[PDB]
Every structure is written in C-alpha cells, then in structure tokens.
C-alpha cells in the first residue's frame, strides 16, 4: 500500500531509558505508531473505502496486486479515534472508543524516528517496565512483547509498500496472522473470509510469521511470560492453512510455535502470587514493575517490584524441574506434564535465541479474544477440564467470561497503562534514570 494524507499522522511521543553497565541511564525520545490494520484504507484518488466492515471493495480490490496499487493507508487520530495517549514515559490504551464509529483496542510499535521502528537486541540485556492492570477485567489482555519485524516495516523488500513503519506496516508474530489486510506490499483480499463473530475482521489467503517474545500478557487476574520460536527467525509470508496459528485449521501446521513455552504462576500452582488486593503477593489494583532478563545461555529470568519490595518469579515444581528460571529443563518438563510438542518441535529455546540475538521491535497492545475469550490466560481451558487436569486452570475467571461483545458493552472504559520503560545490560535497569 501507499500512504495518503486526508488525515495527518502525528505519532504520540514516548520516552524511555537506555541504561549502561557503568550504572547510569540516559533518556531516549521515541514515539508510538498504530498498526496498519486499524487505519482507514481508501482509494488513492478519492475517499472511497477499499475495505469497510469486514468486506473488501470488489472493484478496487479484485486481486492482491491491483488492490495495493489502488489503495492507501491514511493517518490516525490517536486520542479521539483510538483512545491512545502518551505523557512523558507513559502510554495509555483505552478498550472501547466511540467516535463516528466504534474502535476496540490498538496495537502499537515503538519508533526510533517518524519513519522507522526501534530495534532491541534482547540477548545479554534486560527490559523493565511499569504497568497498571487495575482496569483490566477477565477477558482482556494488555500485552507488551517483541517480534522479529524489519525496521522499515518491509519497504526495502517490497517496494509496492511505500507506507512503511510511519503507517505501521510489516507486522508479524508467532500466530502467523492472516487477519492482516496488507502483507509484503500487497493486499490480502485473495481468499478473504469475513469473521463469523466480528463485524470488522476476517482471515485472508496469506499470513505473516516471525519469532515472538511475549514478555507480558496480562489482566488484573492472570499474567504470562511466553517465548515462541519459528523455523525461520524473521518476517516471512505463509500460505493459507499452511500458516498454522490460532486461526488456521491446524494451529500446529506452520513454521511458528503458536503455544510457546509459557510461564503463568497461577497455572503452575501459585494461586496467591498475583491478583487484586492485599491477599496476593503482587496487588494488581496498584502499579507494579516487571523486569525480564535474557542471559546468554538462552534462559529467561524474571523479577517484580511493588512498593519497594522485590520478588523473583515464584518457584515452580513440575515433573523433575524445580526453580524459577525459564530454561530448557522447564520447557521440557512443561511438555511432559501438561502435554504437547509445539515448542520443542519448532526448536525450543535454542531456536528462540536465534531471534533474541538479533533485533526485535517492541509492541504494546490491548485486545479481547474473538477465538477463545482469553480463557487460556485467565480461566480453565479447555472449559470441560477440571483442576485434576495438569495445567488446565490458568486463573480464577469463570469459563463464561470474556465474550467480546459482552466485555465491550460492560467494560468499555477498561484500559492499560505502560510506563517507565528501561532497557540495558542485565543488572542495569534499576539504576537512576537520566
Ligand atoms: O542513589 N541515588 O539516588 C543515586 C546514585 C547515583 C546517581 O548517579 C547519577 O546517576 C545519573 C542518572 O543515571 C547520572 O546521569 C546521567 O549520566 C549519564 C552518563 O553517561 C548521562 O550523562 C545522562 O544523561 C545523565 O542523566 C549521573 O552522572 C550520576 O552521578 C544518582 C542517584
Ligand atoms: O488460544 C490462543 C492462545 O494459545 C496459547 O496457547 C495455549 C493453547 O491454546 C492450549 O491448547 C494449551 O493447553 O495451552 C497453551 C498455553 O496457554 C498461546 O500461549 C497464546 O499465544 C494464544 O495463541
Ligand atoms: C507464591 O509465590 C510467593 C513469592 O515467591 C511465595 O512467597 C509464596 O509462598 C508462593 N505461594 C505458593 C502457594 O506457591
Ligand atoms: Co500467495
Ligand atoms: Co541462568
């Protein structure tokens, strides 16, 4: 797609800290940009939509190439359309925003310049942020994560994409998402099927795969940390069901691991660690700090800080595994105890380290789940299981929770706030900000 300018594009500024081994931190100035899927897509020479509801224009978009030639992405009114605001080092995303139309959530990338994404090399480093999940009920996911996206949003590889990172192009993740309207500088109208339960979305013939570090997927009830490897590390197109991922026939039939090696303390047995109020170790009614450390072995370490008290990731015992480091032994024990082989089939933490060795883009989002109602995060899943099934219970939410239309109607003012991002060598991000 190209870019149009019927609507100006002004990326909300966002600062973050780059810390160094010598003990100091230096303020960085970036901005956030919304993913292309949320934008108005229209004809280059008029205001006629190329996409509306969950249908492509059959005249403007008879095939993927013609559609991309005929159509452009336009600018975003971040606050008034999308409920996205920033202030200094803080980013807030509202759940439902009513303007001329209804908007649900957002997916945002951290920029280096107004035309390029910020890349981070996670291996050897740590990432810290503060979050307020107090206004996230059952069924919602305020997510902070990394994906192996190109810094230019795909432009250098696909010159029919002239919109680029400035307009939030080039997304990929470990679900090999097929809901994307543009992939690799062409539309995704070929094979498009509207979603049965979402008036605004569908599934096309192409998807976009890459490695994904899910640092944080959470609401006020549950949280999870999940690396997802792929057989090809970086962004790559996939074809149809061959994509695998959540929305293909066989989620396991593609090049990415859609499940991951997940660590949810509640799922692992500690039902008192994270939740709303003073009966939990971490009180999700209050802001908390989350630190994630990528040691060079390929293992992942985690600690939390709230009100000046520090907690390592709680210990878990699972099969022959015991500890609090997300390592090969944990991931292996998890497959043995809970079931499945997706993570190991895609090459495990060894394959994952090939991603964290290179650059990844920071993503912050807020979403509800039109596939599984977020039950995999915060409830019992599958819903016919009981606590006697290892790993079935992931949080205290009812198995009836998280129906998108219901939570959108009941909790439209839900929101997440991410703030105080700090990045640098392991051991550095707790030092004084600059
Ligand atoms: O315990 N404290 O509260 C405490 C201890 C040490 C300390 O040191 C000062 O830290 C600040 C912030 O990290 C340093 O400033 C930064 O230095 C950077 C050096 O590359 C760069 O110039 C940054 O822009 C600047 O903010 C400062 O030099 C330390 O003395 C502060 C508080
Ligand atoms: O449902 C989408 C969700 O799946 C996660 O994976 C689940 C998987 O669905 C389930 O069958 C298994 O028992 O538990 C896995 C871990 O919760 C992914 O972690 C997540 O990315 C979503 O894609
Ligand atoms: C949960 O984790 C906290 C923090 O490590 C610990 O103090 C507490 O004993 C754990 N509780 C259970 C039930 O595992
Ligand atoms: Co094709
Ligand atoms: Co270690």
Gap from CA of 67 to ligand 2 centroid (Å): 34
CB distance 56 to 50 below 8 Å: yes
Domain ranges of the chain: 2-434
Gap from CA of 251 to ligand 4 centroid (Å): 19
Q: What is the number of the ligand 1 atom nearest to the C-alpha of 434?
A: 26
Domain 2-434 in CATH 2.70.100.10? The answer is yes
Pair type for strands 25-34 and 106-113: antiparallel
Could you tell me which of 271, 269, 241 has the C-alpha nearest to residue 255? 241
CB distance 405 to 292 below 8 Å: no
Gap from CA of 339 to ligand 5 centroid (Å): 25
Gap from CA of 431 to ligand 1 centroid (Å): 8
Residue 170: count of CB within 10 angstroms of its CB: 32
Q: Give the resolution in Å.
A: 1.1
3 lines ligand 1 (CB under 6 A): no
Whose Cα sits closest to atom 21 in ligand 1? 26
246 lines ligand 2 (CB under 6 A): yes
Gap from CA of 26 to ligand 1 centroid (Å): 8
**Separation of alpha carbons 15 and 28, rounded Å:** 6
Positive or negative, the Cα torsion across 104, 105, 109, 115?
A: positive
User: What is the per-residue burial (b if ≥16 Cβ within 10 Å, else e) of 407-426?
Assistant: bbeebbebbbbbbbbbbbee
406 lines ligand 1 (CB under 6 A): no
Place of tokens 């949280």: 223
94 lines ligand 2 (CB under 6 A): no
CB distance 304 to 273 below 8 Å: no
24 lines ligand 1 (CB under 6 A): yes
Taking ligand 5, which is a single-atom ion, which protein residues have CB atoms under 5 Å away? 295, 299
258 lines ligand 2 (CB under 6 A): yes
Residues facing 415 on adjacent strands: 94
Q: What is the number of the ligand 1 atom nearest to the C-alpha of 27?
A: 24
Burial class (CB in 10 A: 0-12, 13-18, 19+), 189: buried
222 lines ligand 2 (CB under 6 A): no
What ligand is nearest to the CA atom of residue 24?
Answer: 1
Gap from CA of 429 to ligand 5 centroid (Å): 18
């Amino acid at each position: 797609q190209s870019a149009c300018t019927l609507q100006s594009e002004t990326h909300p500024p966002l600062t973050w800290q780059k810390c160094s081994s010598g003990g100091t931190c230096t303020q960085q100035t970036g901005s956030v940009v919304i993913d292309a899927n949320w934008r108005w897509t229209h004809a280059t020479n008029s205001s006629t939509n190329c996409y509306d509801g969950n249908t492509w224009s059959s005249t403007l978009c008879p095939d993927n190439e013609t559609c991309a030639k005929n159509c452009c992405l336009d600018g975003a009114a971040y606050a008034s359309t999308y409920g996205v605001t920033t202030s200094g080092n803080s980013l807030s995303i509202d759940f439902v925003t009513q303007s001329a139309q209804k908007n649900v959530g957002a997916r945002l990338y951290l920029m280096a310049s107004d035309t390029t994404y910020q890349e981070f090399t996670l291996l050897g480093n740590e990432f810290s942020f503060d979050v307020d999940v107090s206004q996230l009920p059952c069924g919602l996911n305020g997510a902070l994560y990394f994906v192996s996206m190109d810094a230019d949003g795909g432009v250098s590889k696909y010159p029919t994409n002239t919109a680029g990172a400035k307009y939030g192009t080039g997304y990929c993740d470990s679900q090999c998402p097929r809901d994307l309207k543009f992939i690799n500088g062409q539309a995704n109208v070929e094979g498009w099927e509207p979603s049965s339960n979402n008036a605004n979305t569908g599934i096309g013939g192409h998807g976009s795969c890459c490695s994904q570090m899910d640092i944080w997927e959470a609401n006020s009830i549950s949280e999870a940390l999940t690396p997802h490897p792929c057989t090809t590390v970086g962004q790559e197109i996939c074809e149809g069901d061959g994509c695998g991922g959540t929305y293909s026939d066989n989620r396991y039939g593609g090049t990415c691991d859609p499940d991951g090696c997940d660590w949810n303390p509640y799922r692992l047995g500690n039902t008192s660690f994270y939740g709303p109020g003073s009966s939990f170790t971490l009180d999700t009614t209050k802001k908390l700090t989350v630190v994630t450390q990528f040691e060079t072995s390929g293992a992942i370490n985690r600690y939390y800080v709230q009100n000046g008290v520090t907690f390592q990731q709680p210990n878990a015992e699972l099969g022959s595994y015991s500890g609090n480091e997300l390592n090969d032994d944990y991931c292996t024990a998890e497959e043995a105890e809970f079931g499945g082989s997706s993570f190991s089939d895609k090459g495990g933490l060894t394959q994952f380290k090939k991603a964290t060795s290179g650059g990844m883009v920071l993503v912050m989002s807020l979403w509800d789940d039109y596939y599984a109602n977020m039950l995999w995060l915060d409830s019992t899943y599958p819903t016919n299981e009981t606590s006697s099934t290892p790993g079935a219970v992931r949080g205290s939410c009812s198995t009836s929770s998280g129906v998108p239309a219901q939570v959108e109607s009941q909790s439209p003012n839900a929101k997440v706030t991410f703030s105080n991002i700090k990045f640098g060598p392991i051991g550095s991000t707790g030092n004084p900000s600059g």
